[PDB]
Design a protein around this ligand. Sequence first.
Ligand code: GTP
Ligand code: MG
Lengths: 115, 85, 115, 320, 97, 53
Amino acid sequence: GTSVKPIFSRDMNEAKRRVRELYRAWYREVPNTVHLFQLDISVKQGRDKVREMFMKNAHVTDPRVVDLLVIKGKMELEETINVWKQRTHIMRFFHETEAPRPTDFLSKFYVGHDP
Amino acid sequence: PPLTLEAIKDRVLYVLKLYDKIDPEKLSVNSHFMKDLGLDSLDQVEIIMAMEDEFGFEIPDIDAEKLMCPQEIVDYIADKKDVYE
Amino acid sequence: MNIMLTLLTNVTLASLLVLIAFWLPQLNAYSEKTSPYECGFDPMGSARLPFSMKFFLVAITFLLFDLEIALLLPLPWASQTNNLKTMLTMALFLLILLAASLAYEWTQKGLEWAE
Amino acid sequence: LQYGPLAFVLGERTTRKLTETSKVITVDGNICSGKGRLAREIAEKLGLRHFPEAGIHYADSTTGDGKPLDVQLSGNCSLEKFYDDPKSNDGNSYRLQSWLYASRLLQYADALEHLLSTGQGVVLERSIYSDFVFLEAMYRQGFIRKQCVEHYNEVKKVTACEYLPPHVVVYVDVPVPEIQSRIQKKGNPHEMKITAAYLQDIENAYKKTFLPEMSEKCEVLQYSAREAEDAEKVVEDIEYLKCDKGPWPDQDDRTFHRLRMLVQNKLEVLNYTTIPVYLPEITIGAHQSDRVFQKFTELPGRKYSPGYNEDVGDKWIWLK
Amino acid sequence: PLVYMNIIMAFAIALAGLLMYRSHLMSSLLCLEGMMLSLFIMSTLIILNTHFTLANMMPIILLVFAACEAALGLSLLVMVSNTYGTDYVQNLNLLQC
Amino acid sequence: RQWQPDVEWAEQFGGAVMYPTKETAHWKPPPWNDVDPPKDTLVSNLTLNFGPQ
Ligand SMILES: Nc1nc2c(ncn2[C@@H]2O[C@H](COP(=O)(O)OP(=O)(O)OP(=O)(O)O)[C@@H](O)[C@H]2O)c(=O)[nH]1
Ligand SMILES: [Mg+2]
């Protein structure tokens, strides 16, 4: 039948726990991340750039997808603990140099055939 | 200097309002964060963080999920490091 | 003061070489050039963490042995005395004493790298 | 005359005497799980010395004539009373465990002393490393108070720290329903007074704590109940065993010298089993201490040093 | 003479330096080691001045045991640095009682 | 029976200092084995970045 085998999160509750200790590791990670990683951004914008990515994926109802994502969350997390990534690697989360993307209909009409 | 229940009252009360989103007007002893303070349970994470670092103890997820009002959190910790006044 | 004159000249001549190798050949530093080298990547962040020895045992024995050789430096003059008989025994006695200490350390492990 | 620092200087080594079969092996199991038999068969099969499980009067077995003395003079604790009324206000539960810990502690020391002296392998039922589990089951049933657990783990950590894990540890797995059938068949009236929760508690704390941490310290052999009867099969595995996992191989003659000197001085062996922690149950009052010790004195073969008591019949005293 | 004054006040600040621990034992241990350098220079100054041929002995032999004192000294610091990790005298107080 | 010392009298000179004060009120009598237990692990092996240059 349509019933499926979960890996770690049987339902939303345990999955909601797993996204919580991601915050638990991340929140105490951002301060010394900036400290160790020679970053010039402050902790304040470091904290909420972890925030909005939770709402970047705050629509999935399938527990497996949350579980499939919880592994990657600690993967990028662990990649930051032992300085494996470089400055540009974490800067890629900080969208900083690209041109702003148009939003209103007048802007994309004035830009080109982009729908 | 042993702490008191009143001491825990002001310890929680102080660190509650350095949270930018927490509004002092909505803040009270009975402040349901998700409706009175308008804070998602995701936001609920970074309060009890400031609890465990300033109180110097550890709050499990199986306990931090229902710690909701400023009254509940006070009586939670009071049983933990054994302050009963 | 002849040794002073050559010593003064020597340290002087060295100082000119570093002097005109720091001002004449241009100056352009922009941080990442000034950064430490970690074979291309960014260091874990330290160069100050305890780099604990694994041969600490042999280091102190060097002090005892480098000290005791200073006891037998007078040997060339010690040969030209009226009492080479006790000179032979005493000077020999030192060399067996170093030999015994080396033999003692050798047998009870010692010189091999402590793990 | 026994091996001391002088013997080490003269030439009395101990890494020479030990051989491949110089293994100290402890069997383990549940309550009346038949592991005591397996200790006997493996002992006689490979020519290993068998040490029965240390009872309340095991110390009486190694002292004097080897007969069990009076309980009031050799512990003031009865396993039957522990069976009948576990929650007795006197506190026989911790008196059972603490006294039995030192009896096993004396059992373990004598086993290692024989292994280090002669080199002939020694097999004993259970050990000090398997003693904590009985108290853990007790606390998991309301049998004991938490302060007793604190005292036990304190002395166990203090006393068992400088000892080494035994060469091979073998466990027989008998389920609780099978264990209940065995004890019911036994018919000893004291062992109906048991709790099935206690029997799973002792079983759980074996496989959850004892076997796990013992695995990295020495080889673990989990054996099925039916396999245990095949005494031929259980011994081939222990014969061709790696015997490398643990602090046993990295043991020079000097550290062996420290171990032998510790075990040979019996008073030191259980010296720290009398920690001055003033537990309400563990402590015996001054008047009881004097009267009971005064009782111990005129018991035959106890007033003076061994080989010096006239009531025993030791002659040549005036020039002994 | 004035050369003598310079090198006995070398002792004094070395004396002050030794029995004044700020952070770690290594700096004080080095001060103990360097303390004998004044002791060496001190003893050496009289002995060549006074032309006493035999007693040129002791400047070298003072060096045998003063540096041997240091030899067991920094080897003792090895035992600290394994149990203690660091070499701080402020932490070096586990026998508070 | 003449009065013999009880448990409570034993605790008189039973602490770290039988004659205590606030300064030593937080002390701790030495362990009976006279060996302090090992503290937090103090291994800090540095990381070497071999390659790619
Ligand atoms: N507290 C305590 N009780 C023990 C100890 N050793 C044995 N007993 C008790 O001995 C009784 C019988 O169980 P066991 O000794 O484990 O086993 P057995 O009945 O001799 O049978 P086998 O396991 O086959 O040897 C039970 O009441 C046990 O609790 C011990 O070290 N401490
Ligand atoms: Mg048994």
